[PDB]
Each structure stands twice: as C-alpha cells, then as structure tokens.
Design a protein around this motif. Structure first.
Motif, PDB file in Angstrom:
ATOM      1  N   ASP A   1       0.807  -1.215   0.000  1.00  0.00           N
ATOM      2  CA  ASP A   1       0.000   0.000   0.000  1.00  0.00           C
ATOM      3  C   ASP A   1       0.843   1.269   0.000  1.00  0.00           C
ATOM      4  OD1 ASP A   1      -2.167  -1.736   0.150  1.00  0.00           O
ATOM      5  OD2 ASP A   1      -2.272  -1.605   2.342  1.00  0.00           O
TER       6      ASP A   1
ATOM      7  N   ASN B   1      -1.938  -8.765  -4.740  1.00  0.00           N
ATOM      8  CA  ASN B   1      -3.179  -7.989  -4.785  1.00  0.00           C
ATOM      9  C   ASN B   1      -2.908  -6.544  -5.209  1.00  0.00           C
ATOM     10  OD1 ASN B   1      -5.986  -7.707  -4.591  1.00  0.00           O
ATOM     11  ND2 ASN B   1      -5.883  -7.053  -2.444  1.00  0.00           N
TER      12      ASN B   1
ATOM     13  N   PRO C   1      -3.494  -3.230  -7.136  1.00  0.00           N
ATOM     14  CA  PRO C   1      -4.556  -2.538  -7.875  1.00  0.00           C
ATOM     15  C   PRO C   1      -4.155  -2.351  -9.331  1.00  0.00           C
ATOM     16  CG  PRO C   1      -4.113  -1.449  -5.781  1.00  0.00           C
ATOM     17  CD  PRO C   1      -3.019  -2.451  -5.980  1.00  0.00           C
ATOM     18  N   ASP C   2      -5.049  -2.762 -10.236  1.00  0.00           N
ATOM     19  CA  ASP C   2      -4.748  -2.733 -11.664  1.00  0.00           C
ATOM     20  C   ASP C   2      -4.308  -1.349 -12.130  1.00  0.00           C
ATOM     21  OD1 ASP C   2      -4.883  -4.682 -13.971  1.00  0.00           O
ATOM     22  OD2 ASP C   2      -6.088  -3.061 -14.831  1.00  0.00           O
ATOM     23  N   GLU C   3      -4.799  -0.292 -11.476  1.00  0.00           N
ATOM     24  CA  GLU C   3      -4.453   1.074 -11.848  1.00  0.00           C
ATOM     25  C   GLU C   3      -3.008   1.435 -11.521  1.00  0.00           C
TER      26      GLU C   3
END
Lengths: 723, 402, 402
Positions: free
Chosen positions: B318, B341, B343-345
């Motif tokens: 994160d 995990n 985030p695709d962005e």
C-alpha cells in the motif's frame, strides 16, 4: 602401460605378407569375455604389434568361438564398491589404451565378426578400421550395456559418436542397447561389408588389407576422426545446427524415461556430448569416469543381479525339478479363441507346434486364427518374416468347433472364462478325448489350481499355465503347482516355456498366485490415495516416476473394475468362511463408488479416464469433486514408495509362505509379469538394494517401511523374516 | 550512509526484429548515442568524476562481446579513468546494473556511476552465447530445464488464466503504451537514434500495434506449442508439477514480449557528487533485493524479490504508488498481481514490453527510467520496479521521487 | 557503515593449456567443486542467507555462457533465492566480483555474498566472445587497438627494461611460487579437483617450471614479434607514442602469464551475518577503487588505481605490508614497482601468474585469497591487490587482516 598369472586367450599368426591374425580363443569358457585373461592377453599382443611393427603390414582380429566376443565380466563388475572406483577407472583405461594403440598402428586392422559381437565385443571391432560380418542367422551386434545399468566403457560411446554423431549414436545405438542383425548393421554403418559364410571372413579381411594398402596408402589404418579435416556428423555441440536442438535431448530422454530414477541413460548422453566437445583421447577418459560412476552404483548392481544372474539361474533350471527328463509335445490343444487363446495358439505355432485351436463356433475359432493372420500380415509387410514361415506355421493352426477334433493331443492349454464350474465341465468333456498322459494346463489369474484339478481324473497332469496378454509380446509364463501336480508335469511345462522362447517361474498354489496377488497391492495403494483425497494427476505421475510402464489408474481401467470387485468378494469369502473378521482394504470403497457411478473402466466406455472411439482421453474431470482431490498432498516420494513397498512386502510374504521358491523367480516374475521397475532389479531385489534417506540395504528398507506404516497404515510393517 | 540518487534516465526507441530501423545500428552505437545525449544535457559536468560504467547484456558475443561498456567509454571519448564492466543476470541485467551502481555509491568508494544496458536482438539473437543450463546434458537433466514460454503457460494453467485473460492484458498494454506516446509521457526520455550525419533512423517504439483488437489476438496461434510437444519440455515441467495434468498453452506472439533492439542509460551518484556537478536529483534509490523461486517454472521470482525489498525498506504494498513489472509473458504479470493484490491502476501504467518490446540487457534500465518520469509526471512518491528472470531468479528495486 | 569481511577464500589448482589435467573438466564443475568445499567447512551454515553469487568471466560463451553463476547456484543445490550474476572487466573480473560483493554488503541490502571467477582457457580460448574494440574497424581504428603483448613490450622500451630484466623477474616468480608450494603456504586454500567418483584430477599448479634457469629463459623467442610486424600494431602504437623510435620486443612465453584453467571463490558478508552463522572473519575490505590510464599501452592502469584506493583509505605505500599485482607481463610489474617505489620484498611474495598461470576471470579472486593467507601466515596487517586490465583500466583493493 598395456597391462593391469592367467591363461592366454589370443593366438598369434603372421603370414608371409606381414599380416597378423589375432584369433581370440579363451580356454576357460565357451565365449570370449573381457576378463582378466583378456586384458593381459591383449596387452601382450598389442606390445608385440608395436615391437614387430617393422615386419607387420596389417592386422586381422578373428575369433574361435561360435560368437565373436560377448561383453565384459559381470561377476567382477557386480562386486565394485564406491571405494573401488579407482580400480574400475584404471581397468577400463587400460582396456582402451590397448584398443587405441591397435587403432593408431599406422596399419589397417580388420575385424572378422563370425558370431555375436555384444558390448565389449563390438567395442573391439569398433577400434578396427574395417568390419566384415558373416551374414549368419543369430549374429547379433550392439552395445547393450544400458540394459545392465552400465554404459559402453570400452570406447563404445566415444567411437559411435565419432562415427554417427551425438543424435544418431544415442537414439539408435546407445540409449536402448539395441541389438542388430548383420544386414541391419551394414545399413546403419556398424559394419562395412558382408560375407555369406564365416569361412570367407579372414580371406576377405586379408584381401581388403591388400587392396587398402594399394588404393589408399596415405590413409591406411587411419580412422576418419584422426584426420585433420574431420567433421562430426550432425555437428559438434558448438555448431549452430546441433546447438539449436541440443537442449531438447535431455528433455526428450526425461520424457521417454518418465522421470524414473535410471541413471545410465543420463550418463550415456552426458558422456556423449561432453566427449564431442574435446579431442578423442580426452573424450575417452571422460567416458571412463562416467562408467565408474555407474558400476559403483546400486542401480547397476540391481540390473546385473536381475537381467544377468537371476535370468541365467532361471534359464538353467533353478525352479525345474532336478530329477526328471524329457517328454516331447506332438500336438497342442487350445480351448478358447479370445485374446488369450488366440495369442497362445500363435506363440505355440511360431515355435512349430501343431495346434488345434478349439472354440465354441468355427466362426469364433477362425477369428482366433485371424489374430495370427493380422500378426502374420503385419510381420510380413515389415519384412521380419515372409518366405512360407508365416504361411506354414499359420497352416499348423487348425481351427475347430468340435471337441472330437482334439484327438491325439498330449498338451492341453485352456484359455476360456475364469469360472470354475465352467472349467470343470470343459475339462471333463475333453480328458477322455485327449491322450492319457496329456498335460492339462489352465490359464487362470485367481482360481486355485487344486480346486480346478478335482474336475479331472488324472490330477497329476493338471497344472496352471498363466500367460500374459498380449501373449505374443509378454515373455513371462507363470506355472502354478497344484497340490496333486506331479513333478514330471512341471518339467514338461517348464520345457515347453523354454520351447516357445519364454521365461518360466514356478509357483505353489495360493490365492492370487504371485503375479496377480502382488500387482493387487499396487493398484490398491493407488485407489487408496484417490479416496484419501490425493490428486489423480499426482497418483499417475507417482506411478510413472516409480518406473512402472503404465500408471495405476490407467492400469485399473484396463483391468475391468467390475473384475476387481469380484476378486475382493472371493477374498472376503475366504476369511468370513474361516470365521475370522475380514479387514477390508479402503480401496474397495473407491472401486464401489466408481462402479456406482457407472464408470467401470475402459471396457464399459469410461473409467478413471475418458474415452472416445478407442482413444484414451484425459482424466475424468468429475474425479476431483467425487473424491475431493487436493485435500491430501503427501510427498511424491511417499506415493512412489507406498506402491513400491506394498509390492515388495507382498513379495516377501509370498517367499515366506512358499508361493515362490527363489528370489530369482520373484525378481524376474515381478519385472516381466507385473511391470515392476527394472532399475530396482525386482520386487525381492528392491529390499536388499533399497536406497533412500535412511541408508542402503535391508536395514534402511525396514526403517523406511516402519516410517510408512506410522503415517499410512500398519500394512507397511515389515514381516519378521526381514527383521 | 551515502544515499544514491538518480540524476538522469534515458533510453533509445525500441526497434523491431523484422525489417527493423535499428538492425543497421551497431549495439555500441546505441550506447554511445545515449552518452552523447547526456553530454548535451550537462556539457560542463566533469566526466573525470565518473568512476564506472556498468552495462547489462544477456548475449555478450560478437558485436556485444569484449566488455561493450569499456568500448562505449573509449568510443565516446569518456575519460580513460571511467571504468566499464558488462554483467548478465538475464532479463534483470539492466536493473542489476542500476542496483550495482547504487550499491557502489552507498559504499562510499564510488561517487558517480553510469548504469544501463544494451541488447541488439536483431543482430545478436537470444541464446547466441550458449550456456551449460541448456546445452550441457548433465546440467540440463538435473535442473529440469524448461524454456520460459512453457513456464509461462504453466503459470496460467496453475492460476487459471485463460487465453482470453492473457490476451486481455496484452490489449491493455497496447492501449496504455499508445496513450503514453500520444500524451507525450516519453518525449523527454526517448532519445531518437541518428546516424553519423545527424539523419534520423528511429524515433518511436516501432513494435507497438496500437490498433490491436481482442478479436485479432484471438486468431494468433500458440507460439510455444510446437516447442513443447517436439521437445518433451511439457512432460519435464509436469514431472515437477505432478498435480497438474495438462498444460494450457495460452501464450502467443501477441501476449508475449517483443524481440527488439535498444539501449538504456541511467546516471547515479551521491548527493555530494550531484551538488558538486550542478545536477538535480530526480529520485532516490530506497532499497534493492535479490531473491528467487522454483527454476522449473522460471518466472515466479518477482514475488519473493518484491516482498524482500518491501521488508527491507520497511514498507508495504500500500505504500507504493506505481508497480512496474516487465511484460515477458502476460501470465507472469497476472500472477504477480494476484500474488500481492496489486490494484490494476498501479500496474505497468504506461504499457510494457508486450507493446514496446523487451531488449533483454536494457529492459531493466528502460522500465526504471519509465518510472522516474511517471512518478514526476503524476507527482507521486514511490515506485517499485521488478523483473522475472530465467532460472527462477528475482530482482526488485524501490525508488522515491525527489 | 556495515563493514565487509572475507570469511573464506579458496581456489582450484591451475591446469595448463597443453595436455592439461583440467581440460576434461567443465568450467561449471570447477565452480561447483569449490561450493562443495565451502559446505565441507561450514556444514551447518544457513545458505538461505546467501543473497548472491557473483562470478567474473572474460569469455562468457559456450560452456561459460548463459550466466554460469546461476548455473553454479542450481547445479550445486544452493538455495533458489541465492542469485547468480556473471560480469566481465577483463583480467580484473575476479577482483571486480569481490569488490562488487563487498560494496553490496556495505549498502546494507545484501548480508552474505559469494564472489569469485572461473576461466577454462583450454576449452574456451581468449577472444572467443568477439568484441567491437578489436573486430569492428571504425572502433578499432579510432581507439588505436594494440594487443596487450605489444603494449607490454612498449612499457619495457619506455622504462628501459631489458630482456634480461624481465627474464630476471620471471625467474624470481618461478622461485617464489616453488617456495610457497614447498613451504605449505597454499595447502589450506588450493582445493584439489576431483571427478564425480572422488578420484583425483589435479592437486597442484602444473604450469610451474621450478627448474627454470636464467639461461633457459634467454633461449626463448619473443612471442609478440610475429604478431607486431605482420599486423602493423607496432606502427599503430608508435603513432601514439611518437617519441619512441623502435619497440624492443622483450616478452616471451617464459616471462608472460601462462594460459591455464581454474576457478576461485570468496565468501563476503557483514559482521552480523558472520556472527549469526558462526563464521570467523579473516580480513576486512578497507577500500576499493576503479581508475585507468592510456588504452593504447593498455597496461598502466594499476598505478592510478592503486594511488586512488590508497588516498581513499587515507594510507600511503608505506602503510601496506604486501603488494600483489597480477603477472600478466613482467614489464607491467616492474613498471608498477618503479612507479610507486615498492620494496621488492613486498611484491608478489608467493609468486604469480608467470609461474602458476592466469585464468582470466578467476585470477583476481585467486590472488586476493593468496593475500588473505599470507597476511595471516606472516601476521601482517594490510595488503593491496591490483591488476592491469585490457583497454587501459585499473582496479585496486586494500584488505586488512582481522
């Protein structure tokens, strides 16, 4: 030095033209073998060629036995411990130093191959500059060291790679130890010329030397790889063509071996490619270090024990009654024309035995003869046989739908349904019809011979003769001794198995005999793992990586799952009738569930695998949900060992109970009958030769067995005979 | 301490393999062209303060043999005291050069270093140097050598990535690479290749197919299916991965990295060295890490390497604003994303090697400089750069914008 | 800070070029054999703490291609997280690997690293990888490529080193190498090469000629005289060195380094990593330096590199107890000695490559471990290790006994 007080095995003869004939004739044996007598005799002979080189113009290597030269000394190679690696290395270096000197004399050396030249024998001929072979039937030429867990350590790897290149020498010659007929060898390039009879060999060798000296004097006695412009066929490892496909050689080998722990083919390929990167002499020494690596290992000792000593003790009559004589077989009567009976009628007629193949209908009896037709036609197109051999032997098979047609037969082999009530009447309708002292054999996989014998009058001639399908390809015959079976009947059947060119084992009457009972523990372990939740892909991989020729779930589809169900019913009727409580195998629950789902194997269309028009597909996708595959992920070695140890322990029980009489019949019977992995040397040899993280030998086997029993069930506890 | 900073990061456009614009350009010329560009940007910098030039190169043979980094030092007129060393860690070579240069700066024994890579695959193809892991049977047999493409198909088989899944990622890569070029994201770091007369040779990544359709990728044939069946590598891979029954061959030329030519250069130095030379630091190397995973599947190294560099920096997923993982094969990126995990962005936001190409020795330095620009363009803080490596290796690097 | 320490330093014997004992041994096997030896010495060390394996190699092709360091990690059963990277800085490759490993330790991002080199010159000859500096005409013509041997003759011409002078140093090298072997100086660091059965292959440096006479060296022919006249490299060298009229060709096979096979391995880590693994530090890496000098004469790099590492450590020539400079050519050592006024008793005290051989990629790590042993054997304090490098480069390293 060309040396390491034995006898001499090589005779010297120089003619007026200066050509020396080295005639190999070991007096201590019937064939020429690479023993200590050979190493010293060839050492003296090579020394004399160098000393007398001013009066020698050519050399001819000949033999005085029926065979040219047959491999190395197995009795010595099997005793080589890892602390003897130096002695092994020095020995094969000495052998190759002699051959290399013979090869670089500056004079033509011709090999006169009269009979078989196998292993070290062919390696001697490979060290010559020209090979002439007599086109005699039965003359085999090849390097079969891989079949014993060895490699051709006398220059076989180095020289064949130099002649053919890495790819052709490995695939065709080295990796499988292929044996070649003389016409085959001339075609591939192992032999250069052929002669019709052995008497023409030496005169042709002397004629070739005289012509080679006249035509090619500059290059006489110079191998192609000793010339400056030598180019290896297919290229060296550094050439772009070979280097593009070179990374696929170990992978294809790994695919062919299915991951089984057989180290000899890996060593052959490593030595072949590493040798092609360096000069000949350096390559030869690399080949010696890999050879010592194999001889001092356990896997080569297992295969030497099984495929040399055990197989020879069997073919010598170790299980044959030591008092009986000979009894001929004039006619053979086969009952049933199915897959079993038709094949039995083939191998019997192939050896020249007159056969009366009896089936219920003449149309089915002709279809039984048609099994020989499809084989006689497929063998004809391949040119293996042709000239009337197939036609005359196919004429010996006489189909019949009448029981009366089996007249004068003195050897009955029944291969019909495994139903005792059926076999009682079929034999009863035939015993009065055939000869009085006729052998009454019964091809059975489970039903005890003692019970079947009570349906005939002369029970002393009733015996079990268990063949394996396909009968033409499988080499084992399991002969089962009934309680009433005479020793003469056993000798007559033992001699018949050697007549049809098959290997016999002798087994006393017991439930499941030896092969069927021991292979039962193999499939029961796999079916237990599937019920436990182990992935079916892992079960099949464990079976293939163990060395089995067919993974167990696939094997359980071929063996009809409905047939496996009533075998357990027959066993539960043996203990429950004796009062004791039956302890069922948990694999039976997996069988009943697959039965309940209507997937009883390949025969009924679908089993553990899916099937489409006679072509096996992938595993059934519903298998994973049905048994919750994945909820148990044991180590792969535990899966491999559970299958191997189950058959090993069951083999020991068969030895304790007197089902088998020798570890030779156990090892060979397990390998040739139930597909036990060859690298183990047999189900009995696997115990004395087990090697794992516990150690090596019987003691390490016991600890690993007790470790398996503590984590998978008490059935893995070793018997008292091992403790 | 002596923190290491990135002062410049540039690269050439990537030229394609067939009738490529850079096929006529020596690999040495690609590196010298970037050195010349760095002189244009700081013509008064004392180059005697540059102590080394570290270049990754996976096929150091022929045009790329003989320590091409030292050839570049001499051919470009750089000071004779400026070093020059070639290294090879497969696809991570360009990033290993940056990591090594940053670690030499932290040691205090080097003050200003050039790092980067070069790979001219149209001239010196992959595998031109040989190697024991593939060509030596004993080594090949023991380590169970499986070419990367089959390991990539195995990852999709194990993780459940379908042909449509990997082709979907490939489309996304073509789109983001086209958006990055159209938006001028690359204008200041892609140095056009010119000849000895000043004439243009290539100014854009000519491997890109910006008009790629989902339907057009679906017509492509699995590239690694003829290699797996005829070589038996499938059976080798499944002996190790025994619980997998069948390998689904989802990877083609349209969802794998392209074979291209290119070079990249990064300038790394201490704060004192940059201040002394009037240089402004663009980012700071936070931490580096080397790790690895199973060498049969070959391409699962990024996840251990990324977790190790994150633990070393005292950070979590994160805390990172941009993740850049080389697009050797689509299933490797999808695997890395599912593992951590992501985030695709945040993942390969300007596109990757599937669209723009993968010049082995240079790629690590290319995608690092790509992240220095994008952190600055978005005014974001931290980026993590990692690559999958043949032999199951892993390399990861965290940079922080300054 | 995180100081870097040497915990182990070992090497193989050096096998000669013609009918050598190691010609049948794959370069990979030489490295794995040393890894096995390190396991014998610390069988309870957690190898997961080893984060990288750095191997110098000058001809990374064929048997030595494909990142031989990663092949060694996998073939030896080392943890899959242990890295593996090949590098090339010509003759200094083996020492560059040690320097890089020590700098990775100081950065704090690596805790325990293997460094070393391997070169099997009987199997993969010098120049097998090609290179632009020699084979590309534009690059060759511009940088005035002159092979090292002619640069070595030029050094003797400029400095006034006669044929008898360089042959005198060659004799001294044969004597000190023979005294070092006879006195057991090398017994604990030269690991005999054995085959897969345990059988001995080579246990001593078989290139040595301990019975060399001054008269026998005087009969040898100048090796580089047929290369200089037929190639015109003499005229190229003298265009740069225009005040020198004629080149005196003093170097032969008897006063140059031998062509041999060999490998070396060094284990480097932090103090915390060694204490955690129960390791005892043998020496500390004080400082490293990269520099260089004129690439036409090629072999005057050691003097700037040595002066730079001495300034970095805050030391002088008088603070060093042992100087070890690779004996590529006799005139290079005599030049380095005259430049810095090295007492003859401190210089290559156990002999050098003229007697024992020069396996390019491994030599730097060999002579470094040679100095760790000799500092301990004499109970001395500091050693300086340097090598001349093709292309005019220089690398120097100071170690301190612990």
């Amino acid at each position: 030095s060309h040396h390491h007080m034995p006898d001499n095995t090589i005779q010297w003869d120089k003619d007026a033209d200066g050509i020396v004939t080295l005639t190999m004739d070991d007096p201590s044996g019937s064939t020429n073998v690479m023993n200590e007598a050979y190493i010293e005799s060839m050492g003296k002979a090579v020394d004399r060629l160098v000393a007398e080189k001013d009066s020698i113009t050519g050399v001819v290597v000949a033999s005085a036995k029926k065979t040219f030269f047959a491999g190395g000394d197995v009795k010595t190679m099997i005793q080589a411990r890892p602390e003897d690696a130096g002695d092994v290395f020095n020995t094969v270096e000495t052998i190759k130093r002699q051959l290399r000197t013979l090869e670089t004399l500056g004079k033509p050396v011709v090999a006169a191959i009269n009979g078989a030249a196998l292993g070290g024998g062919l390696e001697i001929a490979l060290a010559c500059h020209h090979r002439i072979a007599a086109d005699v039937k039965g003359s085999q030429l090849g390097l079969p060291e891989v079949t014993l867990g060895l490699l051709p350590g006398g220059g076989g790897v180095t020289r064949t790679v130099r002649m053919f290149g890495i790819q052709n020498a490995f695939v065709s010659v080295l990796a499988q130890g292929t044996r070649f007929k003389p016409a085959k060898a001339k075609e591939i390039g192992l032999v250069d010329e052929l002669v019709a009879t052995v008497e023409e060999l030496v005169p042709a060798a002397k004629a070739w030397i005289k012509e080679e000296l006249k035509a090619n004097p500059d290059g006489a006695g110079v191998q192609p790889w000793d010339k400056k412009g030598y180019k290896m066929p297919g290229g060296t490892p550094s050439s772009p063509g070979l280097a593009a496909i070179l990374p696929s050689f170990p992978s294809n080998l790994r695919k062919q071996l299915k991951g089984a722990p057989m180290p000899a083919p890996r060593a052959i390929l490593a030595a072949a490619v590493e040798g092609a990167q360096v000069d000949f002499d350096t390559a030869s020494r690399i080949e010696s270090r890999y050879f010592a690596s194999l001889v001092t290992g356990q896997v080569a000792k297992n295969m030497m024990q099984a495929f040399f000593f055990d197989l020879q003790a069997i073919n010598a009559g170790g299980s044959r009654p030591e008092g009986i004589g000979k009894t001929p077989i004039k006619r053979i009567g086969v009952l049933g024309a199915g897959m079993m009976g038709a094949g039995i009628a083939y191998v019997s007629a192939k050896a020249g035995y007159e056969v009366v193949l009896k089936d219920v209908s003449l149309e089915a009896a002709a279809k039984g003869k048609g099994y020989s037709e499809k084989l006689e036609a497929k063998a004809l197109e391949r040119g293996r046989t042709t000239q009337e051999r197939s036609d005359a032997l196919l004429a010996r098979i006489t189909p019949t739908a009448d029981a009366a047609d089996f007249k004068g037969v003195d050897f009955v082999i029944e291969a019909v349904f495994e139903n005792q009530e059926l076999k009682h009447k079929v034999f009863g309708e035939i015993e009065d019809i055939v000869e009085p002292n006729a052998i009454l054999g019964s091809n059975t996989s489970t039903l005890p011979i003692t019970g079947l014998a009570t349906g005939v009058k002369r029970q002393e001639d009733f015996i079990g003769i268990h063949f394996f399908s396909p009968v033409d390809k499988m080499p084992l015959v399991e002969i089962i001794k009934g309680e009433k079976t005479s020793d003469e009947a056993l000798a007559r059947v033992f001699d018949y198995t050697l007549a049809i060119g098959k290997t016999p084992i002798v087994v006393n009457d017991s439930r499941g005999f030896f092969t069927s009972r021991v292979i039962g523990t193999f499939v029961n372990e796999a079916l237990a793992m599937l019920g436990e939740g182990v992935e079916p892909a892992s079960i099949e991989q464990a079976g293939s990586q163990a060395g089995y020729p067919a993974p167990p779930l696939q094997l359980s589809d071929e063996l009809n799952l409905e047939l496996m169900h009533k075998i357990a019913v027959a066993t539960r009727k043996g203990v429950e009738d004796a009062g004791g409580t039956y302890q069922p195998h948990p694999a039976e629950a997996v069988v009943e569930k697959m039965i309940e789902l209507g997937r009883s194997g390949r025969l009924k269309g679908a089993g553990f695998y899916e099937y489409a028009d006679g072509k096996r597909s992938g595993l059934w996708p519903g298998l994973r949900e049905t048994f919750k595959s994945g909820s148990s992920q044991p180590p792969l070695q535990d899966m491999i060992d559970r299958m191997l140890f189950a058959e090993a322990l069951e083999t020991q029980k068969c030895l304790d109970e007197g089902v088998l009489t020798s570890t030779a019949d156990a090892n060979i019977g397990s390998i040739m009958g139930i597909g036990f992995p060859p690298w183990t040397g047999g189900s009995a040899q696997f115990i004395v030769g087990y090697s794992g993280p516990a150690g090596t030998g019987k003691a390490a086997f016991v600890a690993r067995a007790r470790e398996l029993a503590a984590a998978y069930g008490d059935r893995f506890l070793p018997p008292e005979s091992l403790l | 301490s002596e923190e290491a900073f990135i002062y410049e990061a540039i690269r050439t456009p990537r030229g394609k393999q067939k009738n490529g614009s850079l096929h006529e350009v020596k690999p040495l010329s690609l590196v010298v062209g970037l050195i010349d560009e760095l002189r244009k940007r700081h013509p008064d910098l004392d180059e005697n303060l540059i102590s080394d030039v570290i270049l990754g190169c996976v096929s150091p043979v022929g045009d790329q043999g003989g320590d091409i980094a030292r050839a570049a030092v001499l051919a470009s007129g750089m000071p004779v005291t400026s070093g020059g060393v070639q290294l090879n860690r497969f696809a991570a070579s360009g990033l290993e050069a940056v990591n090594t240069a940053a670690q030499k700066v932290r040691s205090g024994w080097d003050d200003l270093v050039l790092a980067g890579g070069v790979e001219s695959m149209s001239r010196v193809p992959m595998g031109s140097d040989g190697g024991a892991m593939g060509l030596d049977p004993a080594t090949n047999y023991d380590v169970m050598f499986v070419p990367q493409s089959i390991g990539a198909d195995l990852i999709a088989t194990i993780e459940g990535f379908s042909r449509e899944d990997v082709d979907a990622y490939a489309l996304r890569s073509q789109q983001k690479a086209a958006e990055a070029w159209s938006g001028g994201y690359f204008a200041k770091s892609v140095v056009p290749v010119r000849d000895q007369n000043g004439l243009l040779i290539l100014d854009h990544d000519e491997h890109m197919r910006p008009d790629t359709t989902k339907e057009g990728l679906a017509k492509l044939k699995p590239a690694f299916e003829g290699l797996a069946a005829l070589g038996g590598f499938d059976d080798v891979a499944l002996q190790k991965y025994h619980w997998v029954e069948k390998i689904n061959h989802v990877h083609t030329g349209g969802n794998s990295s392209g074979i291209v030519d290119g070079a990249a250069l990064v300038m790394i130095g201490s704060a004192a060295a940059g201040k002394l030379q009037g240089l402004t630091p663009r980012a700071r190397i936070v931490a580096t890490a080397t790790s690895g995973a199973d060498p049969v599947i070959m391409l699962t190294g990024p996840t251990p390497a990324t977790r190790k560099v994150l633990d070393r920096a005292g950070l979590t997923v994160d805390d990172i604003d941009l993740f850049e993982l080389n697009e050797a094969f689509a299933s490797v990126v999808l695997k890395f994303q599912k593992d951590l995990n992501i985030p695709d962005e945040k993942l390969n936001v300007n596109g990757g090697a599937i669209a723009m190409g993968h010049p082995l020795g240079a790629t690590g330095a290319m995608i690092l400089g790509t992240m220095v620009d994008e952190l600055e363009r978005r005014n974001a803080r931290r980026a993590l750069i990692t690559l999958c490596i043949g032999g199951g290796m892993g390399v990861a690097t965290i940079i922080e914008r300054v």
